[PDB]
Structures are given as structure tokens and as C-alpha cells.
Amino acid sequence: MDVSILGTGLMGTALAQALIRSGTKVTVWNRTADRALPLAAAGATVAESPQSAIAASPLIVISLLNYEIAKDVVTEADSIAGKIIVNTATGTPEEANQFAEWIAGRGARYLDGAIAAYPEDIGTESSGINYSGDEDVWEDVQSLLTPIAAQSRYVGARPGAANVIDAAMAGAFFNVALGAFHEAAAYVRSEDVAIAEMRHSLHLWTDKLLELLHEALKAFESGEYETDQATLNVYAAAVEAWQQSMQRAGQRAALMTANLDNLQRACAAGHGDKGIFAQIETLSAN
Amino acid sequence: MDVSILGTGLMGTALAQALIRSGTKVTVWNRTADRALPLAAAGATVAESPQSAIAASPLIVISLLNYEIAKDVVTEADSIAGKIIVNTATGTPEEANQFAEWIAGRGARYLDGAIAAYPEDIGTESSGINYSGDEDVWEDVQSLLTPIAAQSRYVGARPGAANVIDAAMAGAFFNVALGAFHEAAAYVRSEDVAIAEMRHSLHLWTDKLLELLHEALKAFESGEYETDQATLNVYAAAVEAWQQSMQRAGQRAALMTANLDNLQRACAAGHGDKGIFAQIETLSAN
Ligand SMILES: Nc1ncnc2c1ncn2[C@@H]1O[C@H](COP(=O)(O)OP(=O)(O)O)[C@@H](O)[C@H]1OP(=O)(O)O
Ligand SMILES: Nc1ncnc2c1ncn2[C@@H]1O[C@H](COP(=O)(O)OP(=O)(O)O)[C@@H](O)[C@H]1OP(=O)(O)O
């Protein structure tokens, strides 16, 4: 099954190159189009227009900045009836649900994607894509698309599920954890200790974190938050002492302050004697 | 060189077992002492008293709850002159600096340690210990102690350096990042998406985080925060949109809120067009 890609940015380009290597015939389009020139040389067909790119293939993969631009570009096709549209842009769950419904009312099939991978990672081990929406669609494009990522997974029937997980993992987890590390290193530097002496431990701490994340998920699935060892109360106390150390050292320590606040509410609602994972129970706004 | 361990808790016990396996003669003491019974069977000598345990060995490794208890126990020796004292308790840098000075005034040598490893990890790959204080001491105990952790490192002349790095990595980074993951999963669940569909990506995200941490450290060492790709401004905007999504979904999102605040201050102080690592520059209380 041939495919066309709308968007030859870094990601779009990477998608196109992986698909060529798969042995798939690829047509590309891009709003500028100088950008798509090199892809021509690798085996791709450059199209004059979205309409023309859409018409060329049964499967259209979108890699454009956002959902609004995606909508505007695919509006320029007169017909998409019978086509499979796969939109790999990041965005809100609502964006996905609405895009899905618009696609469906034009007589096209839809699947929504979210890419956890730098462009340069796209053909390799260090690359995953989550997909959500109609499972029948996923079944029809799995073999064609699974090549372009090591770990490709259908994560739910809701069009917006991939976008929810991507926000959660890239935003709520990853970006915040990256910030936490800035607070950490700024703290070390404030105590006149060499930031370099953090370096050799990094992999030990990210390994430990991975094992803990697995364990937190098991506990969130279970409702089993029971002791083991350090309780919420112990953690709350330890975090307060860390916060005070960081402040005495001249750091605002805002993430550490927010963490303490999460821990206290968990304790203050009677979970003080359960394990740290029980902190999940008071993250809601109530 | 024989060693005595004060404290046969889980950690103390683990230290003792590794040292026996090293081929070192070990004497142990513990305040209760039923606890130390099994260690007898593995090859260790149980001592009646701290004084007696101290007298038995040139090198004393402390694994007691905190610095206060450590001080009180070693006060019970009449003499420690000429002994090497290695205190592996976690605590503040000030605790370390003061303990160091007290040890020195009793005519003993000192090194301070911080253990990044669960007890069960102590003899294995997944285990590191940082040491700080007098480098001459480290040189004299390196071969004897390096066995009991895969990655053992001297991290500075300040007695308190190991305690600073441990607070930074265990507290400011790790505990907060673990909290961030609770916010993430609570968010996914709030959007009626299966928390299970986070699981398969975990290792990809902790791998990506590790590479990013390395890169942040390189940038903190350099002062080179320059573009590349996504700027502080883009991040601030993306984080606001994540925060709004999480709140609309009924989550407090306190860590995400604190992260945004860090990002805005960086932008609001004219770093908006540099890369994310420039956020380090406004973490101070000012
Ligand atoms: N307003 C718009 N209309 C149509 N396509 C747009 C667009 N804004 C961005 N794109 C496309 O969306 C894709 C995303 O590009 P980007 O600037 O976000 O980064 P990158 O090139 O790294 O992917 C590109 O294919 C881009 O095409 P251009 O080369 O014409 O910029
Ligand atoms: N007040 C105190 N005086 C002396 N030793 C103490 C102490 N509190 C704790 N310890 C020791 O400090 C060590 C830390 O024990 P812990 O209760 O913190 O956890 P774990 O047993 O997992 O290491 C133990 O060797 C403990 O000895 P006990 O078996 O007598 O509890």
C-alpha cells in the first residue's frame, strides 16, 4: 500500500526515509517544497499540491505543526472518501476527537498518533509511537507503519488517548523531572560542590527511577498502597528537611515545595502510614 | 585490614555480608543484638559493646539511623585515637562537617559516605557510594571498601559533599520526579484512559531522560545555553497548555504549576530565546 506524507519537516522527513527503506512507495508534499527536494533523490515523489498528494495514495500520514494546519491542508483535497488518514501531530485529546469526527464525516478512516522519538531516532530502538482511535484502522496499517518505530502500540479506542498519554509522559512526567534536575544541580552548585560529581551517578538514578515507576503503576492498578518500608509521613518529613536545606542555601526550590504539598495532603487525608504511592489519592482538585 | 560495623540494620547487615565475601574479617555490633545473631553464622564476630567493637578494628564503618545516634554510640568508646571512622549515614552537609571536626579532635581520621543503593543492591552492579572529606583517608580505604559497591567515588574535600549530592539526587531530582509521575498517571486516569498504556513506554522515557540529564550537565558546566531547537518561550507556552489540560481534567497539577513558574522567570529575565537549560539561571532566591 503506497503512502503519502504531508509535511517534510524533520519528523516528516524522517518518517518518509524510514518508509522508503521499508520498501514502500512514498509521495511527499510540503508547503515550501525546497525542503522536500532531497527526498526526491532518496526515492520519493514530490507532489505539487496536497490534493495531488492525497490522490496518489490510500494511506496519508500527516506530520504538520498542529491540528489547525492539518485541517486546513486536508481541506484542500476535494475528496478523501475511502482514504486512511493518520495524524501524528501532538495536541489535546479534544483536538484529536474533533479531527476524528471531521475526517469521518468526509467519508475517510482515521487513526491518531503521538510520536515519542526525536527525528534521528525514527528507524531505531530508541523510538515509539502510540496510536488511538478505530482499532480496525490500526489493524490495516500496523504492518505498513510498525517499521518506522521499534515499539508501536495501539493504546485505546478514544481518538484522544495517544495525545493524553503523550501529554502525561512528555509533560507531567518528563519535562517536570527535567526541571527537578535543574533544581538539584543548582542546589549542588550553591553548596560549592562540583556539579561534575553528579555525572557518574546519573545512570544509576534513572535505572532506579524506572524500576520505581513500574512499581508505582502496579500499585495504581492494584489499590495496594501498604507499608513495606518508608511511609508517607517519613517522606513528608524528609522532603521538608531537603526543602529547608535548599532554601538555607539560597534556592527557591519551587518543585520541592510543590512535592511537599502533595505529600502533606496525602498525610493530612489519613494516608500517612501507607507507602509513597498512596499520594496519588489527593492529586485531584476535589 | 579488619573492619568493625556499628549498626546491623538492613544496610549495616548488607555491608557486613559484602565485606566477609571480600575476604575481610568483620566484627559487628548492634544496639539490640538479636539482629546481629545471623551475621555470626556467616563469619562475623558479634561484640558485646561499641567500645569493644571499636577496639577490635582499625577501620570502623557506621550504619546507624542518623548522626546524633552515631555520635552517642561512638562517645561510648574511651579512645578512637588513630582509628579510621567512615560514617555512611545520610544527613545534612553541616552534620557531616561537624561530625568530621569532632572525630578529628578525638585523634581519629574521618571519611563521610552516602549510599545510593538499596541494601539488596550492595554487592552488585546497581550500587554506588559517594565519599567525601580527607582524600588521604579515601586512598587508604579504597581497595578495602570499593568491593561493596560497583561504583565508588571520592566526590570532594568538603566532609559534607556526599551528603549534598545525595540530597540533590535523591531529593531534589528523584523524589520529585517520582511525584511528577504520580501527577502524570492521575492525569491519564482522569481522562478515562488506561494507566496500563503508560507501561510499555517507561523505559524509553527514562532512557531519554538520562541522555537529557547528561546534556543539561554539559550545559551547566559550559555556560552554553544556545538555541538548537525549542526555546524557553516555546516550553513555557507548551507547559501552560499542559497545565490547563490537567486542570480542566480536575487535577491540581501542583508540580506542573511550579515548573511553569520556573520557566516563566527564566523567560521574564530575558532568557526566553535560549534552550531549556538556561532555566537554571533563575532558580536562586535572589
Ligand atoms: N502554517 C503552515 N501551513 C502549512 N504547513 C505548515 C505550516 N507551519 C508549518 N508547516 C509545516 O509543518 C511541518 C512542521 O515544521 P516545523 O517548522 O514545526 O519543524 P520541523 O521542520 O523540524 O518539522 C513542516 O512540514 C512545515 O512546512 P514548512 O517547511 O512549509 O514550514
Ligand atoms: N536510638 C538508637 N540508638 C542506637 N542505635 C540505633 C538507634 N536507632 C536505630 N539504631 C540502629 O540504627 C540502625 C538503623 O536501623 P533502622 O531501624 O533505621 O532500619 P534498618 O534496620 O532497615 O537499617 C540499626 O542498626 C538500629 O539498631 P536497632 O536494631 O537497635 O534498632
Author numbering:
A (entry chain A), B (entry chain A): 1 to 286
Give sentences from the paper:
Here, we describe the discovery and synthetic potential of an IRED from Rhodococcus erythropolis (RytRedAm) that catalyzes reductive amination between a series of medium to large carbonyl and amine compounds with conversions of up to >99% and 99% enantiomeric excess at neutral pH. IREDs are homodimeric enzymes that contain a Rossmann-fold and prefer NADPH over NADH. RytRedAm catalyzes the formation of a substituted γ-lactam and N-methyl-1-phenylethanamine with stereochemistry opposite to that of fungal RedAms, giving the (S)-enantiomer. This enzyme remarkably uses both NADPH and NADH cofactors with KM values of 15 and 247 μM and turnover numbers kcat of 3.6 and 9.0 s–1, respectively, for the reductive amination of hexanal with allylamine.
In an effort to shed light on the determinants of cofactor binding by RytRedAm, its structure was determined by X-ray crystallography in two forms. Each structure was obtained in space group P3221 with one molecule in the asymmetric unit; therefore, the IRED dimer was constructed using the symmetry neighbor. The crystal structure obtained provides insights into the flexibility to also accept NADH, with residues R35 and I69 diverging from that of other IREDs/RedAms in the otherwise conserved Rossmann fold. A consideration of the variant data suggests that the preference for either cofactor is a complicated phenomenon with synergistic input from a number of residues, but the observations for RytRedAm may provide useful indicators for the mutations of other IREDs to alter cofactor specificity.
